[PDB]
Every structure is written in structure tokens, then in C-alpha cells.
Amino acid sequence: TGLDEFALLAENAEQAGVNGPLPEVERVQAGAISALRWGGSAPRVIFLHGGGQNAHTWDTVIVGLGEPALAVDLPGHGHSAWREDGNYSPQLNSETLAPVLRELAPGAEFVVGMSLGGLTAIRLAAMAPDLVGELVLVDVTPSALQRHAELTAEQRGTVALMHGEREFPSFQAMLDLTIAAAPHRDVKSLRRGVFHNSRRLDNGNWVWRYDAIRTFGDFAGLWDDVDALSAPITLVRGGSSGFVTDQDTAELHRRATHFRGVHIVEKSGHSVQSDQPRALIEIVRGVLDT
Ligand SMILES: [Cl-]
Secondary structure, three states, X not given: OOOOOOXXXXXXXXXXXXXXXXXXXXXXXXXXXXXXXXXXXXXXXXXXXXXXXXXXXXHHHHHHHOOOEEEEXXXXXXXXXXXXXXXXXXXXXXHHHHHHHHHHOOOOOEEEEEOHHHHHHHHHHHHOOOOOOEEEEEOOOHHHHHHXXXXXXXXXXXXXXXXOXXXXXXXXXXHHHHHHHOOOOOHHHHHHHHHHHEEEOOOOOEXXXXXXXXXXXXXXXXXXXXXXXXXXXXXXXXXXXXXXXXXXXXXXXXHOOOEEEEEEEOOOOOOHHHHOHHHHHHXXXXXXXX
């Protein structure tokens, strides 16, 4: 389409149940990392999306919260550079991101990360304390993503041997795939997500903005980082998500120096920011104490 990436923000304000003028937002870049900068040049919160997502996953939450924020595109996602070695490990993501965040979000105490983003946040908190005052993990722990990585490994192996990146005859065909994976979800919300996560080729076909993740990375080291972090950790689970177990949550409590507790969001799957953004806004607002 010809549609600008900020053309649907009224839909995000309605989903967040807020009215009034939309906040200012623009895309920023420092080398390999692209981000959306909301509310001007002094972000209070950094948001890190999950595997297969981009920064726009946070639009509803950011519009509802009304705070200045930086929503970053992880390597291999959104407008951030791909890597030919297909490796978007939390550790590698953190190494690329830290100097960019020092430049674009030096005064943001709070980091909210979902899934791969949440483990990226843990590694940032460890390697760059001065930055990260407080972590909010959305539906992930090191153990939980390790279990997901182990289930998906055979198929991440098989896809790795297709060297095709896929192409799609239409936008609708990508939307059909996303409907198939979440058919109970409002299709205007799904359509908005696919719009941001996809682009049209000159040859009329469509492709995903994200790189197949051939590989994730390191978790023993990631638990050592949890043992060392001083940033308090809040966990947010999806009540309909099996991704994080009660034992996962207890393990996180035992290793963290300051676990603030788990919030369990009724009628949310794994992507709490997509399924129940209003409930996530209230929890993030509470952490801000604001
Ligand atoms: Cl992920």
C-alpha cells in the first residue's frame, strides 16, 4: 500500500480506550538498530518486542501509557539490519543495543521486554547497570524460552535448508496465516499487526520484515546474569499462556535479587501487549509509580 507507518495510530488509541491528540512519534536509527521514538527525545521507558515481532507491537501500550518511550526493533526484525548468520541471541542483541540505548535512551530507568526482548533486557541490565533501574518481563524466563527453542529446533533446522525467504501472492495470504494462528482475535487488530510486520515487493508479492531465526542462544550464562543483576524484576504472565510454568516463576523468584512478583493477566496468551494491552498499561503504569 502507499500507507505511512503512523496512519493507523487512531486504531491503537481506540484499542487502548484513550482519546485526544495522538502523541508525536518518529523512526530513529543508529547503524544496525531502528527504533520508534515516542513523545520527543527523552524516553522514560524502553520496550523490546518478541521473536517474529517489531517495535509496532507496543503502539497500543505506548499510546495508552502516555509516557515518552523508545520501542526498539531487535536485530533481524522491523527495520533493524538482518545478520547472515541468522543469530538473534539475547547476548548478541544486547551487545548491538547497549551503545545505541546509551545514545537514544540514556535516562530511561525502566525496560519492558516480551519473550526474546525480555531475555535481551536481562543481558542489558547485567552488562549496563547504570542504565536499567527496573525490568518488566512479559511472559518469559530464561528456562521458558530455552524450552521453546528446544521444541522448535528440528523445524528451524529444516527451514534453514530452504534458502527462499518465502514470497506471498497477496497481503490477504499473510493475514490468512495470522488468522489461522489466532482465529478468536479481532481481525482489524490482526490486519494492523501484519501491515507493520510485512512489506510489498515491486514484483507485487509480499514478504515478512523479520528474518527466520535459525538460532537463539546461551541460558546458563543468562541465569548468572539474573544472579548478578540489581534491577528489580516484575513478571507479567498471560493467564491462557502455558509458556511460563509455576516452577519457572519460582525459579525466577529464587535467583533474582529482587523479584516484585508475577501479574497473571486473565484471557491473554503469550503476547500480552497484543491480547490485553489495557491490563498491561495498568501494570506498567504501576511500576512507573505514576
Ligand atoms: Cl521469542
